Design a protein around this ligand. Sequence first.
Ligand code: DO3
Ligand code: DO3
Ligand code: CL
Ligand code: CL
Ligand code: CL
Ligand code: CL
Ligand code: GD
Length: 129
Amino acid sequence: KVFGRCELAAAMKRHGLDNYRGYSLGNWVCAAKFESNFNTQATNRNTDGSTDYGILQINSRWWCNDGRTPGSRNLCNIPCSALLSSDITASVNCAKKIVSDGNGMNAWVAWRNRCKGTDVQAWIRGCRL
Ligand SMILES: C[C@@H](O)CN1CCN(CC(=O)O)CCN(CC(=O)O)CCN(CC(=O)O)CC1
Ligand SMILES: C[C@@H](O)CN1CCN(CC(=O)O)CCN(CC(=O)O)CCN(CC(=O)O)CC1
Ligand SMILES: [Cl-]
Ligand SMILES: [Cl-]
Ligand SMILES: [Cl-]
Ligand SMILES: [Cl-]
Ligand SMILES: [Gd]
C-alpha cells in the first residue's frame, strides 16, 4: 500500500506515535516519506547482507527475522515480511522499541539528514486530526 500524507498521519496518531518519547507527529511522517516514499512494500539491501523493510525501513540485523541475515537478532519477535503489510500495526510497535533504545530517532538516517532541525509540523498541515 502507498499511503497518502494525511491518511498515514491519522493511522500513526491512532496507534499512539504522536509525541511518543517526545517526538511530535510531523517527525514520524517526515521519516516515512524519505525512508520509503510512504510505500509499505519497500525493501533495500545493505552492504553487510541485512535488509531494511517497510514504511520505516526496519533493519533485519537486530529487529526482525528474514532467514538470511546470519547471526542476527529478532528483537521485535516478528518475520520481516509482517513489516510489509497494508496494516502498519507491526511496523509502529517495532518502531516504539527502536526509538526507546537510547539513540532516539537518529536510528533513521533519512530523519537525521532531512527532517531534524526543520519545520516538521508542515508534514501534517492541512490534515483533519
Ligand atoms: C536495545 C538496543 O540496544 C538493541 N540493540 C541491539 C542489541 N545488541 C546487544 C545489546 O544491546 O545488548 C547489539 C549491541 N550493539 C551495541 C551495544 O549495545 O553495545 C547495538 C547498538 N544498537 C543500539 C544501541 O545500543 O545504541 C542496536 C540495537
Ligand atoms: C557491551 C556494551 O554495551 C557495554 N555497555 C555497558 C553495559 N550496560 C548494559 C548492557 O550492555 O548490558 C550499559 C547500558 N547502556 C545501554 C544498554 O541498555 O545496554 C549504556 C550504553 N553503552 C553501550 C550501548 O549499549 O550502546 C554502554 C556500554
Ligand atoms: Cl509536528
Ligand atoms: Cl536470519
Ligand atoms: Cl493501518
Ligand atoms: Cl530522544
Ligand atoms: Gd544495543
